[PDB]
Amino acid sequence: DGICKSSDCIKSAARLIQNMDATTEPCTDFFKYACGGWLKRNVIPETSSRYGNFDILRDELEVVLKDVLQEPKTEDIVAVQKAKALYRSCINESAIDSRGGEPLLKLLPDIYGWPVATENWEQKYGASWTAEKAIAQLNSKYGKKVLINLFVGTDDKNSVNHVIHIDQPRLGLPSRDYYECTGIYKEACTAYVDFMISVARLIRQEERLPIDENQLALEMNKVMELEKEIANATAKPEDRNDPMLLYNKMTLAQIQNNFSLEINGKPFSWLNFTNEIMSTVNISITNEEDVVVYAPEYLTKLKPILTKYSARDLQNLMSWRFIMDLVSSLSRTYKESRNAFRKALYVTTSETATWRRCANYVNGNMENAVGRLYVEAAFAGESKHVVEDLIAQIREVFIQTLDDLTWMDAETKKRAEEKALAIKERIGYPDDIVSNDNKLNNEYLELNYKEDEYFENIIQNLKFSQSKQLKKLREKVDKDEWISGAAVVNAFYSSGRNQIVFPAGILQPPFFSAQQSNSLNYGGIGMVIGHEITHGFDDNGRNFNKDGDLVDWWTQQSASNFKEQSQCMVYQYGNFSWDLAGGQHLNGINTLGENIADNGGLGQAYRAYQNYIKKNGEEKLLPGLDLNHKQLFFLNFAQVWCGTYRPEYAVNSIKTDVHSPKNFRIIGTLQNSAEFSEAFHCRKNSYMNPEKKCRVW
Amino acid sequence: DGICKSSDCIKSAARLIQNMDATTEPCTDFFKYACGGWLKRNVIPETSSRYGNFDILRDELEVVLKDVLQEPKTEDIVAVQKAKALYRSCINESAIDSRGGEPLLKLLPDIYGWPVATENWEQKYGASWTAEKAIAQLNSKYGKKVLINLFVGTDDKNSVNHVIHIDQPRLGLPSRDYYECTGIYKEACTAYVDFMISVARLIRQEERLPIDENQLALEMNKVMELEKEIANATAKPEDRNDPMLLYNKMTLAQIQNNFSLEINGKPFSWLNFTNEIMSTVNISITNEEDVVVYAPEYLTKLKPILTKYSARDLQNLMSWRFIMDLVSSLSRTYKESRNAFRKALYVTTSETATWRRCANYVNGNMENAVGRLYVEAAFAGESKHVVEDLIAQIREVFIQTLDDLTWMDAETKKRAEEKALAIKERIGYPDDIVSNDNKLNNEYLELNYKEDEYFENIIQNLKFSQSKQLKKLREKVDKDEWISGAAVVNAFYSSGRNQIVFPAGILQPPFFSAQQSNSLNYGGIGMVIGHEITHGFDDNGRNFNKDGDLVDWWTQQSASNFKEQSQCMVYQYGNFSWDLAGGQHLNGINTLGENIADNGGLGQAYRAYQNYIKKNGEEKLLPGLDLNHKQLFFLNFAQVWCGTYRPEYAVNSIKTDVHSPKNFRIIGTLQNSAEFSEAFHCRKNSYMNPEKKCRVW
Ligand SMILES: CC(C)C[C@H](NP(=O)(O)O[C@@H]1O[C@@H](C)[C@H](O)[C@@H](O)[C@H]1O)C(=O)N[C@@H](Cc1c[nH]c2ccccc12)C(=O)O
Ligand SMILES: CC(C)C[C@H](NP(=O)(O)O[C@@H]1O[C@@H](C)[C@H](O)[C@@H](O)[C@H]1O)C(=O)N[C@@H](Cc1c[nH]c2ccccc12)C(=O)O
Ligand SMILES: *[C@@H]1O[C@H](CO)[C@@H](O)[C@H](O)[C@H]1NC(C)=O
Ligand SMILES: *[C@@H]1O[C@H](CO)[C@@H](O)[C@H](O)[C@H]1NC(C)=O
Ligand SMILES: *[C@@H]1O[C@H](CO)[C@@H](O)[C@H](O)[C@H]1NC(C)=O
Ligand SMILES: *[C@@H]1O[C@H](CO)[C@@H](O)[C@H](O)[C@H]1NC(C)=O
Ligand SMILES: *[C@@H]1O[C@H](CO)[C@@H](O)[C@H](O)[C@H]1NC(C)=O
Ligand SMILES: *[C@@H]1O[C@H](CO)[C@@H](O)[C@H](O)[C@H]1NC(C)=O
Ligand SMILES: [Zn+2]
Ligand SMILES: [Zn+2]
C-alpha cells in the first residue's frame, strides 16, 4: 500500500498530527496550520518568559544530566568525580542557607568593598583605590567587566592569533533601552534600584551597621544615574553590525593618546590598567602593544561622564555589578531579593528547580566532562556519519546554487566557493572527551571542589575560566578546540574559525533521527545545517574569508548587489506586525542576518531533499496524515519552530532580538518559497504566497 | 492487511509505544514493561510529592479552566460572570499583597481572637468565652471543625433523611502518626510549631505588640502538647473501617448523659452547643434529638484531656486550626510562612502557578458553573451514550458473574443482583447545568463577589457552603443531586445513594474515546466502571443495601466467606515490599477495599471485552505494536496507572493510604488474572503468574 507502519513512523506521525491544526488553511497561515495544536496544549511555565520546542528538548536534556550527575559510580575518572562533586555542592541548600551571606562578606575586601555597605570607605579603601586597580581586579580575578570591557580574543584580521580588545561594557539591565526608565521600563528601573537597596540593607544588617533608608536610596539612585549615563554612551546594535567598521587596531600608547580618561581628578593610565590585568597571568605589556578598540566613540563619550563621579560613586556601581550576579549563590534572603527583581523584569513568579539550575551550571563550567556523560547516556555516536553525509550534501547544494545566482560576478562566486569548501564541521562531540581520560582529567587539574563550599567553588570557576582566557594572548588559536559543549540544544557558526557546529543536543527529534523519514530530517536538521552554513555568507559573515580573516573578498558590484538583495528582506520583515508586542513592527535590520540564514537554509535543505529523491525515489508515506513527503518536509520545518512568548517579553524583545519571532521565521521564509506554494497548491497572492519573493542565497 | 492506519490509531499506538519499556519481560514485571518508558521521561515537579497520569490530565484540565475563566464574554449568564469575577479576585496578587494581613485581623474578634497574638485575652474575651460558643462559631460560620466534629449528613440507616453526626476532628498534621514526633516526623513536628510561632509573630508585628520569642514558643509548644493528646485519643482507621460498628444512634440527652465534658472547671452542655450551631440556620434542637456518634471512644477519652487545659490553651489551638488554612489567602509574608511548613512536610520547593490554584479554587466552590464551561469547551456530550452502553455491559457482566461465585449462597446472590440493578449511574455532567440558566443562576444567588476583595470572597464561600449543609437537616436527600462536579479527573461510588459517577474529566484518553480501540476503552474506562461498581460490594459497601441503607443483607455464611476470600488479598498485598518506602510492607487491611475494587473491576472489564468480541469480532490491529487486542487491553489498563512517588511521600503514605501504590495496583491485579498470563504466555510461577490467585468478585 506504500505506507510505512513501523514504530518510528507511527511516533513521527503522532507528533506531526498532535502539533498541527488541520482546520486551518496552510496557504492562509502556515504557523497556525503547523503549530495550532502545539499552542492549544502548551502554556508558558511560571519560570519562563517564553516557551517553544527548544525549551522542551532543553528540559528533557536536563533530566538526562540529573540522571548522569546524581549517582557516583565506581569506574568514574577524576574529571567525572569533580563534575558530580560540583553538582552535589550546588544542590545542598541546607549547607548554602547555613553560611548566610558570610562568603560574600569575606570576598568583599578583595574587590575594594562596596561603599554603601562599608563604614568609613574613604579611610579604609579610598587611600589605595585607583580605577586602574579596581576595574582590573574585577576583570582578572572574577572575569567581571565594568566601565571598560578589556578582553583577550581572536584578532578578526589574523585568526591564528589572540589580541587584547577594548569594548563597551554590558549593563545591569537587559539593554540600553531600559535606561529611558519610562513606559514599559518604569517598573524594571524602580525594581532595579529597589534590588540594589535590598542587597545593601541585607549586608549592613549582617555586619550590624546602622540602616538609614534615605541614605541607601540616595547612594543607589546615584548608581542608576551613573549607569543611565554609561548606557546612553554605549553604541546601538545597528552601529555595531558591520565588522569592517567595528575593527580599529591601534597601539596602547595611541589608545593612551586619543582615549584619555580622568577618574578622581587624576588622569587614567592605560598601561598600568593593562599590566594590572596581564600580571595575573605573568604577561608583560609594552607601551607599544596592538589593541583592537571596538568602541572608540564610547571611550570618547566616557571621559566627560567619569570626571563627574567620585571613587565612592564608581565603586558603588562596580561592586554592585559583581554582587548582583553572586546573590543567587547565597542564602534564602539573598536569593529572595533577586527573585523579586526577576519577577519585575520577566513577569515570572517562580525560579527553575534547583537541580535543573545546578545541572546547567555544571554543564556550562565543565562542558567536556558533562558532554562525555551526556553522549554516553543519550547520543548514538554512529549517527555522526549520517549527519556527516547530510552536511556534505548541503555544502554541495550551496556551491551548485552559486551558479544560479544572477547578482554575483564569476570572480565573487569563485571566492564564495573557496570559503564554502574551507568550512570545517563539528558533529556531536569531540571524540577525545570519551577516548582521552588524561586530556579530560588535565583540563580540570587546577580545580578542587569541596562539597560543602558552593560559593568557594563558583569563585574558583570564575578564576579558572578567566586565567585560561588571559593566558591565550601570546598563544596561537587552537584548531581542534570546540566552540560548544556536546550537551547543548543549539547550532552555531564561527566566522573567526569558519566553522559550523552541531552539538549532540540538537541531533535528536524533531530535527534528526537515522530512523525518521528523510523529508523530516532535511526539513529539520537539513535546514539547521543550511542556516549555519548561510551564516558564513550573511551581512556579518560575508566579511570573513575562507581562513576566518576579516578581509574584503567581494567586488564593489557583488557587495552592492548583496545589500540590494538583502533590502527586500529588511522591508519584508520590517513590515511584519507582532500581535504579542501590541502590533509593533519587527526590526528588519536587527534580524537581517538570521532572516538571510533562515531563507538561505530552508532553500538549500529542500534542494538537497529533491536531489535525495532523484537518486533514491519516493519514501513510503506516513500513516494517518493525508500529506506527501514534499508537504511533510515543510510541516516538520515549521514544527521545529513551534513556540510562543509572554506579551511583556515581546514588547521588549522586538527592539533587540536578532532572530525573528518563531511565527515570522516560518511565515517570512515560506512567503519567499515558490516550492512551498507548489507543495501546498497556494493560489497567487494568498497570504503565504505573495507575488514578490526576496532572495539572497 | 488487517491493520488500522487512522489518525486515531496512530495517536493511540504512539502513546502506548512511548510509555512502555519493550526491553522488559512482561511476565517478570508488567509495571516496568507497561510504564518503563513513562518513568524514564517523567520527573516529579517541585510542586508535587508524586506524579502520574492523574496529574497529567489534571494539569491539562486546568489549562482548559484558565481558557474558559480568563476571558469575559458578552453572552455570559450571571452564574458564569460570578465564577470569572471570583477567578479575577484570586489571580490579583497586587490587590492581595496590598491588604497585608488586615482581613485576618478584622475576622479575628468574630472567632474569639487568637490568645497568643492578643493582649489581655482573658479580660477582652475570656469573660463571654464558652467552649460551646467558640467551637460553634468556628463550625457554623466558617465550617471549621475543632475538638468536636459536628456535622449534618445522610443517616446511614435511612438514606432519605439527614441527621446530626458527631465524630473525631481532623488534625493539623496529615495523620495521627505524625504526633509521635520522632524519626520521619521530627522535622514536620518542629516545622509545625515553627509555623505557629511564625504566624503568631507576623500578627503581633502588624498589631504593633511586644514580641517575646520565649513566650511564643511556650504558648505554641502547649498547642502541640494539646493536639498530641487529641491525636492519641482519635481512633485508628482500622478501628473505623466497619460501618455497622461505627454507627451509634442516640438522643442528645443520652449524649449529654454518657459523654459528659468539663471545660474550664464548668461542665459542657451538648444542647447549648447544638443550638448555638443550629440557630445559624433557624433550626430548633430538642433535648430529644437523635444524633449518630461515630467516635464514642474519642468523646470518652476527650474528658480527662480537656479538664487539663485553660480557655487560653484551647482557643490558641482552635484559632490556629482556622488561621493555618487562611494564611495562603493573605499577603507574601503570610504565604511565605506556609510555604516553609509545606516544604518541611512534602519536600516541595515551589507552589503551583497562582492561575492553577485559582482555577481549582473556583472549580471547587462553583462546580456547576465551572462544569458547564468545561463541558462546552472540552467534552463531546454525544459520548455520554457510548459510556451509558459500557456501564450497561459491565453491570450485566457483574450480575452474570454472581452465578459463577462458589462462596455465596443463592439467597445472597439474589440480594446482590437487587443491589446491582438499583445502582444509578451519573455520566459526564448534569444536563441541567447547560440547559437551565435560572436553576444555575439561583444556586449562586446569595453570592456577591468583589474583584478587589479575595479574602471577603473566600469567607463568603465558607459561610454559604456551611449554611447550605446545616439547612439540609430537616430536608430530604435530593435524588437528582450529583456528588461531583464535571471538571474532575476521578470516578466515585456513593454507598448512601448507591450510585457510580463518571465526571467528564475522566471520560478522555487513555481511559476513553469513542474513536479509540475498544480494547483500550474496556482496559481503561471499562476497568474504572467495574472498580466503582465493585465498591458497592467491598468490605465497606457490601454493608449497604439497594436503597443505600446500612442493613445486613448477607447470610451469616456468605459474609464469613466474604472475609475468607478477602483474607487472601490482605496477605497478598501485605506481603508486597515498597522500594520507595524503604522496602516497608503495604498495609493489606487499609488498602483491602481498593484492592477488591481493582481486582473485581479488571475481571468484569475483560469479560465484557470478550463478550464484545463474541458479538462483533476482532478489531483491526494497531500499527507499530507487535501485540494483539487481548494484550493491548492489559497494556492500556497498566498505562492508566503509570506513576511515581517521592521517597519521603512513600515512607509516610504507606501507613495511611487506602489505595495501593500504582505499581502494586498493576502487579497485584494481574498476579490474580489467569487471562493476563494467557494473553502474555506467562510460565507458571513467573513473577506475574503465581500459582495461587485471590478472588472476591
Ligand atoms: C537553526 C537553529 C536551531 C540554531 C540557530 N543558532 P544560531 O542563530 O547560529 O546562533 C544563535 O544565535 C546567535 C545570534 C548567537 O550568536 C549564538 O550564540 C546562538 O545563540 C538559532 O536560530 N538559534 C536560536 C533559537 C534556538 C536555539 N536552540 C533551539 C532549539 C530549538 C529551536 C530553536 C532554537 C537562538 O539561539 O536563540
Ligand atoms: C479507578 C480510578 C480512576 C478512580 C478511583 N476512585 P475511587 O477509589 O472510587 O474514590 C477515590 O478514593 C476514595 C477512597 C475516596 O473516598 C474518593 O473520594 C476518591 O478519592 C481511584 O482509584 N482514585 C484514586 C486515584 C486516581 C484519581 N484520579 C485518577 C486519575 C487517573 C489515575 C488515577 C486516579 C484516588 O482518588 O486517589
Ligand atoms: C548537606 O550539607 C551538610 C553540611 O556539611 C552535610 O552535613 C550533609 O551531609 C549534606 N547533605 C547531602 C545530601 O550531601
Ligand atoms: C600600577 O600603578 C599603581 C598606582 O597606584 C602602582 O601602585 C602599581 O604597583 C602598578 N602596578 C602594575 C602591576 O604595573
Ligand atoms: C514595508 O514595505 C515597503 C516596501 O514595500 C518599504 O518601502 C517600507 O520601508 C517597509 N516598512 C518598514 C516599516 O520596514
Ligand atoms: C489589581 O487590583 C487593583 C486594586 O483594585 C486594580 O487597580 C487593578 O485593576 C487589578 N488588576 C487586574 C488585572 O484586574
Ligand atoms: C447557650 O448558652 C450560653 C451560656 O453562656 C448563653 O449565653 C446563650 O445565649 C445560649 N445560646 C443558645 C443559642 O441557646
Ligand atoms: C504474607 O503471606 C502469608 C500467606 O502466605 C500470610 O500468612 C502473612 O500473614 C503475610 N504477611 C503480611 C506481612 O501480611
Ligand atoms: Zn542564526
Ligand atoms: Zn476505589
Numbering used by the authors:
A (entry chain A), B (entry chain A): 53 to 749
The study reports:
Neprilysin, or neutral endopeptidase (NEP), is an integral type II membrane-bound zinc-dependent peptidase of approximately 750 amino acid residues that degrades a number of physiological peptides that are involved in processes such as blood pressure regulation and nociception. NEP is composed of an ectodomain, which contains the catalytic site and belongs to the M13 family of peptidases/proteases, a transmembrane domain and a short intracellular domain. The structure of the ectodomain is composed of two largely α-helical domains (domains 1 and 2) that are arranged to form a central spherical water-filled core that contains the active site of the enzyme. The larger N-terminal domain (domain 1), which is structurally related to the bacterial protease thermolysin, contains a single zinc atom that is critical for peptidase activity and is coordinated by His and Glu residues.
The overall structure of the double mutant NEP is similar to wild-type NEP, with two domains which are connected by three interdomain linker segments, together enclosing a large water filled cavity. The second mutated residue Val399 is at a distance of 20 Å from Lys714, located in the smaller domain (domain 2) at the surface of the protein at the interface between the two domains. The interdomain distance, as measured by Cα-Cα distance from residue Val399 in domain 2 to e. g. residue Arg698 in domain 1, increases by more than 2 Å (from 5.9 Å to 8.4 Å in wild-type NEP and NEPv, respectively). Furthermore Lys714 limits the conformational flexibility of Trp693 and thereby reduces the plasticity and size of the S1’ pocket. The overall binding mode of phosphoramidon in the NEP double mutant is similar to that observed in wild-type. The C-terminal extension of the phosphoramidon binds differently. While the phosphoramidon tryptophan pyrrole retains the interaction with Val541 O and the stacking interaction with Phe106, the positions of the phosphoramidon tryptophan and Phe106 side chain moieties are interchanged. Large ligand induced flexibility of amino acid side chains is observed in the substrate binding site, with particularly Trp693 functioning as a switch between the S1’ and S2’ pockets in wild-type NEP; (P1’ and P2’ dependency shown in Oefner et al.,, Glossop et al.,). In the crystal structure of the NEPv presented here, the two mutations have reduced the substrate binding sites S1’ and S2’ as well as decreased the binding site plasticity.
